[model samples]
Target: EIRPTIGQQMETGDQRFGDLVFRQLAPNVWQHTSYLDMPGFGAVASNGLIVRDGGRVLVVDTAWTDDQTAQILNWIKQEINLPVALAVVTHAHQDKMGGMDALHAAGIATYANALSNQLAPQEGMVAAQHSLTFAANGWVEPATAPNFGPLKVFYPGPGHTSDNITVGIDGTDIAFGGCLIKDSKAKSLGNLGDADTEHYAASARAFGAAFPKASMIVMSHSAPDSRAAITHTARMADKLR
Candidate 1:
């Protein structure tokens, strides 16, 4: 079982669990917040990665709400002034993409599967209209696309959800799998009744075949320091049976 955060509450300088940590994995690529705790669930949030190609930074996923988004952004600003290039939603889960509003407000482009672009709005309305439902449903509205710079959108296929998509960054040996594939072992499948398990598994396998040379697999809910688990996850379609 995961241990509780010991000692006093983590502050800015503290490299503790509650205190977010930002580390550079490459010359310009950085990973922040390896994990975070939330109500009801234990520690479910995973590393929120930031990739800076030049003047733009691509944020992998946003967590919880506006407050959580703010914390991540603040950590980013401390490292660079580059505006957010794009916000890649691994899946439509609220904890994964709930902060779309915050990112859009900051003039950032949010990308998700075209299907998500459709259903997200309806699911979002139900969550936002009612607070109790919002808490239970984890619903979040789709943020409007920002008008700042050029970008690319690719839908790998449905893995974790019907709308799960894989995002690729040119020149980087990495692809953000979002929650299409579990990044870690402990992450149990959340409500997956709507998921097409067969299609989901096939989609992940396709991603692997499509991008075989990728050196890293970034995820929405776990540490991506290594892509070994990612490769295993991509090939997990067979076990879903």
Candidate 2:
């Protein structure tokens, strides 16, 4: 058991079965890792969040597929023993919304940026049950849902995707950057298939600015990284422009 409020060395143990690996990042926060192995890329992993606060469990994103997401949901039901009443996916990519249908089937209410839901079904994923109009530069609390109270969802312009967003957990210093911020191990921004490279730099800085106290950015493709995901990514995107 470790509290990583200060850095990335925090280890809160993990459970592994099949392609799902769930680990706790703090007392009320968790990280789940799953992978989608590409033909030549092998296993490309992703990380999503699970948080418990306000007497409810909330999920930031989902695993790569419904089966994996079901595993995560089962873990919560059996271990944490709480039904996930709320979930928010950060974008339209498979890594973020692939398990959306599973969440819907479980009767969990899900929300995403209005733009994100519009693009999810085009990418072969189910649209979240609700669409939220996230503020461009400020944090958007899940309206009336305090169940996800600590969630500070923000729309920092378009970088990874037109609907890309970031989430900062209130009680802890860890911020979930989704794919908008790359991990330290990443050589490039990874994919630009649906990215807004022109304004990516500004978005990265806004992400850092929005959470000035964030010490570690929990990324989707790799392990957690320092704020360099912001600084380093901004620099990299600038060169692309």
Candidate 3:
């Protein structure tokens, strides 16, 4: 049930485009593994996550449009009957938070950082003007800074975005690191014009170490279901850097 975006047709040479590439990264968790083919914009796709505990669900980092968001939701509905309890924005990037309005309209609670609530509007504006001007999507403003699910949100201090929060569902061993860390090929932290790269790397390392022992680790982009995967991602963060 995804409507194609003008920007979704643009190609990035050898890689893929659109919301076509996804990997079930963990139990009840999924990740975007490739780029998008925007008609005029090129490749694009943002990472997001979902955790279902009992009949409640939490969506992390909603991607740029309702089209992409719906794809995942439909997939989930087909497999699990859980209703979304909350939508979490790991960082303030558009691709991460752009679909908020549509998601909220569907009756899900939306969460954002205090800082993100202040900044996302401006970013969302920019995303529309520069990337998808024809896009009719907009996010619902959060009345209060949203917390991470039923789980307490932890700010390791501003690294990725001033609003970066690592979420762990209460008694569960699964933790979602929004865009806090990238895939294994990532070296160092990503470009820091919007973040403190050094601090970001340090924080990522802290996230990796903080859990000491976890049954699963969910990143915004990869499958987070194994202690081994978490360790591998953390190690890759260091190794790639």
Worst lDDT window (10 residues) for model 2? 1-10
Displacement of the residue 68 alpha carbon in candidate 2, Å: 0.8
lDDT of each: 0.56, 0.81, 0.55
- Write candidate 3's Cα lDDT for 1-241 as tens digits: 2223321222232123345445554565545432345777655545566676667777766766667667666656766777877776655676677666667667776666556766777676111111101111122222333433445455555566665666555565666666675555444444456775445555665665655555666665443445554444455445434
Higher-scoring candidate on TM-score, 1 or 3:
1
* 1 versus 2: better lDDT goes to: 2
Give per-residue lDDT, candidate 3, residue 215: 60
Record all residue pairs in model 2 with backbone atoms less than 3 Å apart, i.e. clashing: none
Candidate number of the best TM-score: 2
The candidate maximizing lDDT is 2
RMSD of 1: 7.9
Tens-place lDDT per residue, model 1, 1-33, is 233232112234333323455556567766655
Q: On a 0 to 1 TM-score scale, where does candidate 3 land against the true structure?
A: 0.66
In TM-score terms, candidate 1 sits at 0.72
Model 1, runs deviating above 4 Å: 1-19, 34-41, 125-153, 183-191, 225-227
Q: Assess every candidate by TM-score.
A: 0.72, 0.90, 0.66
